[PDB]
Every structure is written in structure tokens, then in C-alpha cells.
Subunit: 498 residues, 4 copies
């Protein structure tokens, strides 16, 4: 029997595994080491969670290797691999309320949003990639013939093997799902390291793989520290690919580690400072609604969040007035209250960074219009914040807050190339957006923006079929869409003479 | 007017540029520094070549950046970019004898081979990729609609920008062409670092880009050292991708440097220890001819060379006997002489390694059947070598010679999985081959071999349309074929709401 | 509430609808006209089925048009269309025993085969194409730019609209599923005409679309005659595409009718006379098993059945002896009995044709080795038959039997091109096969065979992912695979200047 | 030595073949039959041209069949087929002034336009498709495995064989080139029937195939009548595919003939009545320029010409005034004169139809604003024409003029869905257009338009890389782009068990 932490909450009795998941079983870490996971709504300890050690990483990688090389997963038809992944999505759907509640408790995700996005999109991801399994195809190629003989050349798409995936804490289940679905659909096996601060939905997910009948060792989950677990995964001689999502600085380190061990493949989904350009010829009330969402969605803990808004001079003051009006209407509180719009920040150290970020913004001369502070109440709540009079040289015009902080600059009426230059003057390149009713401006701006995703007259519109990844120091490689599969496949060329 | 080293040779008058090529002009390096390039047929100095410095790398990158951002290359139609690359191929064709002669002098490539392969395949590479320019396409994707509104999602394929490419010395022009053609077809601009020991066809190529009308700064060429030029390219904040071909150990360093600077993209085409499995049921005389070619082609300086031959017990002794007869018929000599079929090794340091390699082979207990030594004559000639009684634990069963050394092991009659296990017991995974008349065996073996390319009843059958790249510590990414374009493109997702 | 014909059989209760299915309801035909459907196991009447009239065709097309233009099917996300088709496959699976039993009663399909193939592959088909819905993608194309302006060109894949599909009787549910799954996945609506002699699984399928929640009018089913119902579908001005499977002569008429009405798109999956070439170097015992399967599978009522076997002279006599021995072992009888492996022919007129076919074979001088007659028991059973000494000019060498009749010719030892000529001497080109252990022969023969499918060392190996269709007078267009979708999609090119 | 009609015009000496082109030679038709080709600028006879008979069609098809089955074209590498097609494009470019002059004499094409489009796009078409030859690729497919055995399934793309193509007279060389280039790139051989009235560029093209070294019999050209030559091509037992461009009514007959003979594949590029919707929020002066182009380009002999303009009420009168001002500036004259804007109609019978068309427009009650008449000068010139107050029930609202007649209707301010319904109320669906600055309207309207091509803020923007084809009674199949290749290829599925 699996040991659970039991909790009666949100009309449910949650049953939460808290141990490492290796080779299809929940097990204590070496020396039974544990750590505390903290509820951000009140700062209380949810439970103790196993703290993976090096020997545990080695056990997990060994179980993944055996599952890949000798287990059922490497033998079944691609179509049957698809069936299992569809079934996993069904099991996740059957537990969707429980998963969303766990995400509310562990990450501070507003429950209504967690149902639809954190969990709903996770389900869509497994279903989408389940469909790809038997539709991954190689080629036959019309090469030059070695006359008087003949040649046939074909390519085969094959799995890469044992993969390690390292996940951040902002959407714990969803970020896990994005990478894991594509990885498994391609026929690989995996060791997953969730962010230390948010292990619980990953562990519940591990249990669901058992209910779905995923063969033992195909999925292994190791809560613990990046500097220990993530490091060993990146160094391991039997891991052939790392999928990493997190900060640019840690990304650099991970890629270095892959290089120095066995030149394992790596994908890097790193930070952003994404610009949103709002022209005077946009629908203004819609621009305010979408502009607010671009910043405040999931309490700003959103890698594609608009980190600068450029607003055309003639509409700037009305835009800011409408924003302040809307911001005052936002309900801050417990993620389980059904009218909550704004939940708490994910953990204490992040809240403190946001406090300092805003002090720095004021110190360097930006205008704090509203917010800027921790909300006085238990837990780790931060006020929705608006800065104006932001200039291009400022720290807050360059650095990603990863919090609910709207950072506004004017641009001159009738200018286009000049605002584009400013929007592109970052080493990041993850996302961007443009609001305008003018088809010509919309198309030109989307061409010129140096970012992996461009939203036109919307924001935060990701989709499991639409590839997602950054340019420049936001990294490389895609999650989602057909393109995600390529990170997890290798191509073998086979050439016959006959 | 360009400064040339003039040489009357092979019934031609060679005109060889010898300077750095930056922003469409031939220039001396900082401080007029130079180094000598050596003719491997007699060990003499061909000429002095400019020795690129750090300031020269920065100039080249700046010229590439300007050509990309502001020059004609970034403005013209993809179709017209194609026309220029085709014209480049035509200019190379018009200079084919001259290019093949330069490759004979600089790399010791046998002239008849250089004409057909080194140069002939380079021409095919530019023509093939010229065809791809206006056929690189993105997608429109059926995402979920934000009802009552509608959504359109498309992807755009865009160039990555300024690329650095670092090339080895075994097929100087061909290896340059593989990477450069795909890079340029994708709309990028490039800084190329040829191997220090083989700069001359690259510099002549640079002049041919002028004749073809390639805009200034699109192609820049920096002869010099890897530890200086290559390092600065991998470190440079304006370079966005490195394409690297060379040793696994240098590959590890390159990738690390990419990580620590600006997480530039990297492709790695590294070493191999490729197995060739010869079954008793093959066509024996053909297996001898193709087995010969798998080792001795281009004096063994061939990344896909068979590094181990596994021969079935019942035909082993007859195979070895027939190989020896054919080895004895090989004419060793000056690459410009028409009856030469074995030219000299590329440079002195490589010759020294081959000598040491065979010393270690004999020391550890392998049977040296013939060769193993430098040929007594001027230059850097190495006697075609055959080892038998090679056991799996031996150094020469594990390490890549990159020379004309056939390394033969036996396997028991009727065994298949046992010989596959041995063939796959390497950290490399570049190429492999199987000779057999049995359809079932050929298909099963090609499935089970852990290599990026599998040859069936042939060897060394590369084609510009067929992708080429390794698994495991042989690296990642493809040269050739449609797949090669992906390394040099980025995908932007554009999502509208309307 | 739906009216059923109820029957207790095969350890279940069959509930069979027997009326037309139009706009989501079961309804009598005009004038309450009906016809009898006949059980081929005993010659008895299963039940009366509604006989669709021209006015019923018009009602069905109108319901399909309305469902497409104004109903939910034309409004929902592609992903949600996928969900509904996956639910339909689930519902089919829940009713798999019932469906397979109906197929045994209506078509004479051996129940164990029907469960695995007739029904099992139908379920796979819906699941395969359900996965395609949100993976059907258009392109973005790098066209020449009208400088100083810019251009964006994309393609959109759109449904064709109302489709008519006309099905033969050999695999009633399976043939329906092949076409219907691809058609619906592409977002079309459909009017289906099952063969008059086999309406029952189509009508049960109709009921299952209600259980799955497929919107009204998306699927319409019209049992009746081709000369009436099929004709009107091909003539109808609101039908935009016809998918036809059947004889070559009816296909000609269908295509003509499409031309003369509104140039509706058409696919034709027509007859075949498929050659199987068996070389002396094959595995003989396996060649007998697979050779028998190529002819006798599904009592020979199989469009891809091998219609001629060419057997190398040196193994001919031993092959024929072994076939005769295995034929004697076949259990002919009631398709619901578990030991049965040869069921009755589909209907009486077909049995009569087979009797006449074999009489003609004997008259023209072929050696009847075994079979040739009706089996002396109730229903329409025909003996598994073997002819030898078949010459190229013979009627039975040219005409498709569509029954369990093995038609054997010799070819000289060592001939390859000579037998290929004879194998290709037909205006048909549906399938073909070759048995040999020789890799060079297999690859060469598969190149040279003029047929849409070539099996190598197997036969009857169809798969929902592998496209299926003929060449020459076997028609054009594919069922199955990604390729099938193109028959049911139209491409809209959209070009912007900005 | 080829017989020519020599003519000194346009500062060149034209050398025009005038005979049938069969199996690499120019030959007289049976009984030395001829007909006159007429210059539309003055009505004079240019020369006598061979008049192909049935026996001549049989000779051409035989030559094409021999070239495909036994000639060099079926033996060479795909890459070398590409080389020949690129050489063909080069030869066409070397003769571009001569070809453009012939097109001016034969078709009345304004010379400056013929250089850029009639000939310029023809050259681009051959270069584009030349690049496809070695990039046409099949697939490897992950089918279910027949355990304990394994399966490999691949597809091969193969040529269809002998094709017949039937061309109209509006862009004689360009229409020939569209179809011929894709057909030959796919590896087929061809018999071409140019429109009887415009045979000369086709015959000159034939001679250029000799200069380019295209093997004899690969291209055969038969000037003559459709009811004889075209009919026999559609009926021929050795022809496997017909590519037809022309009227809907002849298309119907063509498809019927394909049906009744050997179910040869057919593509149909038929008529159009393409709508152009102009919103009040467009750029008006640009809308006038592009609106005029949409009608008057190539004297209106343009299958995608806007056959109706719907103009928003508030801008209608100003739009009409501006069009009138600009029409008065058009220079009507000899197509060889550099100042000519508007050349003569293609032939006399077509001119007479246009006169009758405009009489009927006035009779039925539309307002004739300008033009409507034959210009008073020699040859077959027609005045650029503008109708307003066109109602939906009028003949000129339904029928394709195929001449320079702008047919304008109003729609109410704000009335998007209503104008769409009117624009879609046709059985044609070839092209369409929308002018608006509003991104929402542009995207919504392009979704809703029932046409194969939608232009947004432009018109007549075709490109060799963008597929072109209609919906509904405008036919099916694409010319141009990757999609065109599928009409000229067949897919063979090869499935191994091992
Ligand atoms: N290539 C493939 O995928 C494939 C698969 C299965 C079978 N087949 C071929 O099908 C043939 C066996 O079936 P069959 O001989 O019974 O075929 P068939 O006579 O051509 O009938 C096929 C269907 O067409 C209908 N039909 C007849 N006349 C029509 C008309 N004028 N307009 C529209 N529809 C009309 C028939 O209706 P009724 O019910 O009234 O007869 C039946 O539903 C064999 O040659 C076999 O190879 C091919």
C-alpha cells in the first residue's frame, strides 16, 4: 500500500504521495532524508517530502534504462504506446479536481484557474501527443544511383533513450506535462526533477501512471534540490537528453554539464522580458483587459508574461487610468475562494525578491502608480503593481520580475521602427505581443519582433498544437506542437545498394 | 586586385589567395602575422598564410552582422538567394580542376578523387541547397478557438543570424561546403574557421564567392588556430549558432563555451568507431572491395570509416587472404600522378599518431598482418595496415585511428545478437554497415545498430539529400538533406485573435 | 425510441435497426418500401430493411448540408471533433461482439476474424483519424516580395463539405470505416450508401454515432440500390465529393456522373488481379501459409487477394502438394462456430459466379487440382479451389474471381524480368507480393511491380497508418494513412500585401 | 535543320518553328494539313501551322511512352533530371526577348509585360520545379508489428507515366510551363496540346527543349483542335493522366472521357467569377490601382480576374470617379510599343463575345460608365469598360467575361455577412479578394470566402511556390507549389515482414 498524506479540503479527501517514485514504487530517499513543503496561503507546512540523494538519482536512471532497453515500453507498437498515453490523460481527467486542489495548496494556484489551465491543459497535452505516436514518420529519399547498381535510402525516427527533465515551480503539473508527454510519445523513458518547492502534483501524477498501467520505470520522479539531483542527471553517463526549463543562468550551467559528461542533447526554455506594444488604433477596453492578463495571469509567475508594455502617447494616460480602475476591482485571497482573482506568490523567497524589485524601480526613478508591496495578511501575497515613466536604461526595463508587475513606457505617436528597436533591445526573446486594428502594422510588427512567439490582439494564448520556445538568451528547442517531438527523436539513415 | 601565390602545376597555373577574407576583401591579419602551410607529399612549405587574431575575429563577426542586418542578403527574395547559391556552384564547377589541384597540394587528396568527391560533391551540395531556399515552409495550425472569437496560428521559419562554423582538415572544401551551403540557404551569414593545416581551398572558395556575386560580409574566412579563432567565435556575443565538426573532446569544449557566453545554438559532428559486420552469406568478392573502401578511402581520413570489421568465422581466413592481395596492388605515391591510389596522410602530427596507434596495437596483442609504419620516402605517407585477432578490450578496438588501418575481429557462425552487442559497445555512434544477401538479417541488423547511418551491402555511400550525423558521443544534428536546414533556422509562432 | 430487429445469437442479444438513418433519426423510406437481407449461412431472411428512394437521398443530402453549414460540427474545435471521433471508437469497442456477430450473420464473416479485422480494424481506423483532427496543418510560403512592400502567403486546409460514400459488401463495416473516419476527421458531413446486400452493420454503426454524441445530420445512411441511390448521390448538386469502392466498370460510370453534374471530386478504389511471385529461395513452409492466406483470407472476398501465383519451377510441384495438404485441413462451416476457418460466400449470386468461373477455367484447359464446387450444405459455401497449368491468355489469368480460388503458373528457374513482365501484364494494379530471402531480388522486384501495394515476405498486411490504393484501372486516391485526408480536404491559398 | 518562319520585328530576327513536334523532331501533320495563326494587332496571318490529326496524336503518345519506358529520362537520377530542367530554364532565359516578342505577335501580350510575366514566370516555374526533383520524398511508417515478427512499411513516390496536357490561349507559354514543369519534374513524359489560336511559343519552346538536351520523346507538342487532338488524348489507352485548363463545360467533357476510357487521373483548372470586396476603411487610391489591376491585367484575359467588385456604399461614388480618371490615362496600342498599357484581345471570336456581353449588360439594365465597345483601329482591341448598378440577378453578375470589364455592385455600410453571401452565391470558386485596413475584417472575410485563392490588399499576386486551384465548378487540383507535384506522382506502399 502507498503511504499518503491525507487532507480533508475543498470537499475532497486528498491522498498525496510524498516519497520518491522509482521503478514503479514509492520509496524513501537514502537515509530517509526529508524536507518541508510550504502552503503559500498561510505559510504552514503541508507535509514532509523525501529528499533525493545521488544514489537515488542513480537508481532512477537505472530503472529508466532497464525500462527502455528491456521493458514492455520498448517493445509495444507505437499505436499501443498512444493508447496508454490517452489512458493516462483519462486518469488525469478522472482526478482533475484533486490535482487542481493539490496545485492550489502547493503552488498557490487559484483553484478555478488550476482546473482549466494547470490541469486542463496538462490533460490536453497528453491527449495531443498520444495522437502523434503512430504518425511519427521518416522518409524515403531519391539519392544518386551507383550505376549499374541501384540504391534505396530511407530514414527511421527512433527514440533517444533515457531522458532527464528539470521543471520549475510556476505551473508544476503543466510544465511537467508539456515535456513528459512529448518525451513519452517519442518512445523514451524519463527521470523527472520537479522544483524542490512544488513536488506534490508531480508525485500524485506518478501515482496516476500506475493507475494508467504505464510500465514500471518508464516514469521516475525525484523531488529534491537542483544542485544535487539536477546536477547528477546532467552528469549521468546513461542519460542521453536533458529537457530544462528555468532561469537563463541555471540553463547555462546545465548545458555546460551536458557538454562535459557525454555530450547529451539539451533543450533550454529560459527567461523572458517580453514586450507588448499597444497602438492608439487598438480597441482600448480590450487592450486594458488583455494587457492586464499579460501581466497578472497566474500572479505573474508566467514565463511569457509581458515584462514591458509600450503604450502609444495619445492613449497612455487613459490606458493607465483604466488599468488602475480594473486593478482596484481584483479580489486577492485564498486560492480556494471561488471569487479570488489573485492568489499568493508561490513561495517566501520569491515574494521577498518582488519587494526588492519594486524598491529598486522607485529608487531608479520610475513612478509607482499602485501596489509595490506585500499584502498585509498571512501567507505570501503581493499587490498587483503598476509602474509608469519607465525608461530603457532602468533595471526594471531589463530584468524579469516573474511577478504581478506592470511596467509601462510611452512611445511616440505614428512611430513604428523606433518602438520595435526598443522592444528588441533585450538579450531575451521568448514572447511578445502587439495590439492594433491595423492589419499592416500587425503584420510588419510580427515580422520584426525578435521573439519565439508573437501574440496579435490577444495574450497568453498558448495551445498544445502550437510550438513554444525562445530565441537568443531565452534558449532553444520547442515544447508543444509537432516540433516538440524532434527534441526527443533521433534520425537513422539506412542506405542499401542492390 | 587580389594578391595570389602563383604555382605552375598539374598543367595549370594556380592562383591562390593566402590572406584573411573579411567583408568581401582579402586582408592581412593584425600585425601582418602569418604561418606556413605544408605540402604532405614532400614536407615543403607551399606558402605563408595570414594568421587570424582576436581583433580579426571581431571584424569578421561585425562584417557578418552588418551583412545580415542591413546588407542585401537580408533583403532579397529567398528565390534570389537560391539563384546566387546556384551561380556559386556554377563558378566552383568552372574552377573544378584548379580546386582539386589545390586540395591535392594542401591535403594530399589524390587528384582523381578530389575532382570526383572533394570538389564534385561540394558542387552538388551548393546546387542541392540552392533548391531549398524558396521551399522552406512554416505551418498553419488548427488551435482551439477562444469563442465567441476566432484564432489563427501560423509559424514562420526565420534565419538564426550570424553563424560560426569550425571545420576539420580531412575534406577541407567538402566539409566547408556541407555546412556553409545549408547555413547560407537558410538566409544566414557566416564566419568560417578552416583547419589551420588546410586553409587553401577555403580561401580560393572565398574568391569564388566574389565571382558569383555573393554580397560582401555574407561569407568571411579566418585561417588560424582553434584555441584562438574558434574559441573567440564560440565566445562571441553576436554569434548565435556554432556548427562544429571535429573530435569529441574539442566538441565538449565548444559546447561548454557556447553555454557560458550567450547560450548560442550548437551542432556537433564528432568522432566515430563505426562497425562493419560481414556475414558468411554475403557476396565475398564484393565484401572485399567494399570492405577495402570502408577503411582505405581518402587514406582513411574519413569520419565514417569502418573502425572495426567483424567477419563471420567460416569466411574470416579467406576474407583476410583476399584483402591482403588487394592491399598489395595499391599504388602509393604523389596525389597528382594518375595511377596513384593511396596518397599521403594530411599532416605530420597525424602521421605521428598513426605510428603510435599501431605500436600500441602490436603491444596489446593484435596480429599485424601488414603495414603499420611510415613509408620510407619524403612527406607523410603511411603504409596501408591490416590487424587481425582483435579483441574487444583492446585499445584499437575502442579508439578511432582516422587512418588507413583495417581492424578485424571474428564472430561465431550463426551468431547475430552477440556480434551486435559487441558492435554497439562503444560510446560513439556515427556510422555502421552490414554485408549479407539475407533480407531478414539485413533489416534486423539495421534496426539494432546504434548508429546515425547504416550501410547495407555498400559503404561510403553519402548523398547530399541524405542526412548525416551521429548518436551518443558522436554528437547531434545533421549535415546534408532537408534535416540540415533545421540547425540553421528558428521557428516563430504567430497567434492572432479576431 | 428506435425500432429494432431483436435476435438472441452467439451468447448475446442483437438489437439491429433496419430503417434509413437521416438527420439523426431512423425513418421508413418513401412509401415504406423494403427489401430482404439474407443470411449466407442458411439462405434465410434476417429481416426487412428500408429501401431508400430518390426523395430519401435528397432528404439525407439536405440534412448533411445543414449539419455542415449551420450545425455544431462546423463550429467546434478540430480538437473537439477529434474527441468525438475517439468517443465513437470507444462506443464501437463497447459493442465489438455485437458488431462482429452482425457481420457474421449479414456477410458470412467468420466471427473470430470479424472481431479482429472487420470490427477491430474499424475501431483502429476511427482512433487513428481522430488523432489527425488537430494535426492537419497548412503552410507559410516564402514567395517573392512586391518591393518596396511585403507579402505573406499561407495555405489553409478546409473541409470539402457534403460527401457521398459508396461501399461494397466484402467488409461492410470496415470499408465504411476506412472512408468515413477520414471524411469526418477532415470536418466533412456524409451520406453513406452501404451495398444493398449488406446493410446491417452500417445501420448499427448509425445508432452508435447517436450514443457517441455525433451531431444530427453529420452521418446519414441509405440502404438501397446503387443504380438508384448511388446514382443520385453522384448527380446531386450539393454533394462535393464522392468516395467510391467497387468494380472498375461501376467506377467509370460514377466518375462520368461526377463530371456531368458539378465536377465533384472523386476517388475510385476499384478491382484488382494481383500477382504473387514465389521464388525458390523463400522459406517454403511459410510461403505455403502466406500464399494460402493471400487467396483464402475472408473466403477470397478481398480486393487485394492474390489473383495469380507465379511459382518458380523448381519448387512448383512441392508447393502445390503442400497447399493441397493444408486445404484438406480447413474447417468449412457456420461462421459463429469457433473451429470454423472458412465461412460462406457473401450472397447467392456471387456463389453462382464462382461456380461458373471455375467451369470456364476447366473448359479453357487449366488443371483443377481441388475444389471448384459448392459445398453440399445449407447456405452459400464454396470449396477452396486450386488451379495449376494456368497460361497467360486464359480467362482465369485475366479476370478477378473475388473468391477462394488459387491460380498458379510456373516460371523458369533464374528468370526475374520475364515473370515481372507477365505479372505486370494487366490493366489492374492494386496489390502484389514477392516471397524471397534474397535482399537484391526483393528490392528489385518491388521497384518493378506496377501496383499500389507490394508485400515482401508477407501478404494481407494492411495498417490504418499505411496508405492503400491502386494504379491504372484499379483507380486512384488513397484510403488509410495521412494520404487519405487529402481526398477530403481543400487547400485555400491566402496572400497578403502589407 | 529545322524549318522556320523568319520575321524581323522588335529589333530581332524571329525564327519560329511551325510544325508538329514528335519524338524530338519537327514534322508535318498527316496529309500536310495546316491552318492560319492570326496576329490580333492587325488581323493579318502570321504563318501556316501544322494541323495535327488522330494518327499524329498516336505517334506523339507512342514517342512519349517509349521515352518513359525505355529512354534516358526514365533511367537518370532525379538530381540529373533537375539539372536538365534548370538548363531548360537557362535556355528560355537566353531566348527571353524572342519568346516575349512571339507572345506579343501570337497572343497580343504587351511586350514589357510578356518579358516580366508570360516569359519571366515561365522561367521561374522551370527553375522552381527543377529544385523539387531530388526533394520529392516518400515515408517510413510506424505500423503495428506482426509479433513475434517485425514489419517495415515505406512509401515510394513514382511518376504516373505518359501525361497529356491541354492549355488555353490567355498566357500560352506560362500555362504550358506551369503544368509541364511539375509534370517533368515528377519524372513523367508529356504530349502537349496548346490552344489552336496560340501555338507559336509552344513550338519555339519545343525547339528550346532540343537546345537544353531534353531526351527525344519526353516533350511532344501538337497544335490543332481540342475536339480532335484533345479528345484523342483523353481517350488514349496509354495516357495515364490529363492536366486540363479551360472552361467548365469542356472540363466536364474531358473528365467524362477520362472515365470512359481507362480511368486516367484528371486535373481541372476551370472558369471563375471571382469577387472583390472593397471596404470603406481601405486605402482608397491603392484600392483604385489594385481594383483596376484585378480587372484590366493582361486585357482581362486572366482566369483569376475579379469578375465582380462589391464596393461599400460610402466610398462607391468616389471609387468610380477615381477609376474613370485612371482608365482615361491607359494607353491602348501595339503591344510591341513601349508606351502601350492595354493590348488587343487575343482573337476575333473573343472580341465579338465581349461586344455581345456588354450589349446584354446595357439591355438588362446596368449602368455603363465607360467603354463597352471595340476600339476603332485595326485588329481586335476592346475599350476598358466599367459597369455600375449591377444587381445580383443580372447576366453580367453571373457570367465570366474573360475581358477588361469592371462589374461593380454596392453594399450597405457595415454589412459584412450580407456581402459575403452575395460574393459566395456562384458555382465558381477560383479566386477572391478583400481590401481593408481592419485586421479583423480581413481575417474573417478570408475565412468565409469560398474560393481557392484569397488576396488581401493586393490582387493578381501569384507565385510559383504558392499553389493555385479552384473549388466547386472551378475544378480541382493545384498548379504551382509543392502541391502541384501530387497530381503527377503516384504513391506505392511497400510492406516487409522480417
Ligand atoms: N480497391 C478497393 O479498396 C476495393 C475494396 C473492396 C472491394 N473492391 C472491389 O469491388 C468489387 C466487388 O464489389 P461489386 O462487384 O459488387 O461492386 P459494384 O457492383 O461496383 O458495387 C459497388 C457499390 O456501387 C454501387 N453502384 C452500382 N451501380 C451504381 C451507380 N450507377 N451509381 C452509384 N453506385 C452504384 C453498388 O450498389 P448495389 O449494392 O446496388 O450493388 C455498390 O454499393 C471487386 O472488383 C473488388 O476488387 C475494391
Amino acid at each position: 500500500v502507498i503511504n499518503y498524506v491525507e487532507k480533508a479540503v475543498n470537499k475532497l479527501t486528498l491522498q498525496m504521495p510524498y516519497q520518491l517514485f522509482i521503478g514503479g514504487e514509492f520509496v524513501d530517499a537514502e537515509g530517509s532524508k526529508t524536507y518541508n513543503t510550504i502552503n503559500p496561503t498561510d505559510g504552514s507546512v503541508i507535509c514532509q517530502v523525501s529528499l533525493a540523494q545521488v544514489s537515488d538519482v542513480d537508481k532512477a536512471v537505472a530503472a529508466a534504462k532497464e525500462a527502455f532497453e528491456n521493458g514492455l515500453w520498448g517493445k509495444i507498437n507505437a499505436r499501443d504506446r498512444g493508447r496508454l498515453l490517452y489512458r493516462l490523460a483519462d486518469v488525469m481527467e478522472q482526478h482533475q479536481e484533486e490535482l487542481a486542489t493539490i496545485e492550489a495548496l502547493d503552488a498557490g494556484a487559484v483553484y478555478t484557474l488550476a482546473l482549466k489551465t494547470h490541469v486542463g491543459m496538462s490533460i490536453q497535452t497528453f491527449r495531443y501527443f498520444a495522437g502523434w505516436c503512430d504518425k511519427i514518420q521518416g522518409a524515403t529519399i531519391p539519392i544518386n544511383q551507383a550505376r549499374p547498381n541501384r540504391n534505396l535510402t530511407l530514414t527511421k525516427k527512433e527514440p533517444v533513450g533515457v531522458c532527464g527533465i528539470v521543471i520549475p515551480w510556476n505551473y508544476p503539473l503543466m510544465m511537467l506535462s508539456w515535456k513528459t508527454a512529448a518525451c513519452l510519445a517519442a518512445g523514451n523513458t524519463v527521470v523527472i526533477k520537479p522544483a524542490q518547492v512544488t513536488p506534490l502534483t508531480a508525485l500524485k501524477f506518478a501515482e496516476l501512471t500506475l493507475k494508467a498501467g504505464i510500465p514500471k520505470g518508464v516514469v521516475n520522479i525525484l523531488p529534491g534540490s537542483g544542485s544535487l539531483v539536477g546536477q547528477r542527471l546532467s552528469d549521468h553517463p546513461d542519460v542521453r537528453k536533458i529537457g530544462f526549463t528555468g532561469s537563463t543562468e541555471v540553463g547555462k550551467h546545465i548545458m555546460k554539464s551536458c557538454a562535459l559528461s557525454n555530450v547529451k542533447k539539451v533543450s533550454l526554455a529560459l527567461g523572458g522580458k517580453s514586450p507588448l506594444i499597444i497602438f492608439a488604433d487598438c480597441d482600448l477596453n480590450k487592450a486594458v483587459q488583455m494587457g492586464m492578463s499579460s501581466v497578472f495571469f497566474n500572479k505573474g509567475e508566467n514565463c511569457i508574461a509581458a515584462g514591458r508594455l509600450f503604450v502609444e502617447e495619445s492613449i497612455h494616460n487613459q490606458f493607465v487610468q483604466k488599468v488602475v480602475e480594473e486593478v482596484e476591482k481584483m479580489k486577492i485571497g485564498n486560492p480556494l475562494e471561488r471569487d479570488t482573482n489573485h492568489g499568493p506568490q508561490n513561495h517566501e523567497a520569491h515574494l521577498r525578491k518582488l519587494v526588492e524589485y519594486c524598491q529598486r524601480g522607485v529608487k531608479e526613478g520610475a513612478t509607482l502608480v499602485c501596489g509595490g508591496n506585500q499584502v498585509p495578511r498571512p501567507g505570501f501575497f503581493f499587490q498587483p503593481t503598476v509602474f509608469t515613466d519607465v525608461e530603457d536604461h532602468m533595471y526594471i526595463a531589463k530584468e524579469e520580475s516573474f511577478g504581478p508587475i506592470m511596467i509601462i513606457s510611452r512611445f511616440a505617436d505614428g512611430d513604428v521602427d523606433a518602438v520595435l528597436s526598443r522592444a528588441n533591445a533585450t538579450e531575451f526573446g521568448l514572447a511578445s505581443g502587439v495590439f492594433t486594428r491595423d492589419i499592416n502594422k500587425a503584420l510588419y510588427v510580427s515580422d520584426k519582433l525578435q521573439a519565439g512567439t508573437v501574440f496579435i490582439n490577444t495574450y497568453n494564448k498558448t495551445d498544445v498544437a502550437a510550438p513554444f520556445g525562445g530565441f537568443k538568451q531565452s534558449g532553444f528547442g520547442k515544447d508543444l506542437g509537432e516540433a516538440a517531438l524532434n527534441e526527443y527523436l533521433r534520425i537513422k539513415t539506412v542506405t542499401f545498394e542492390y
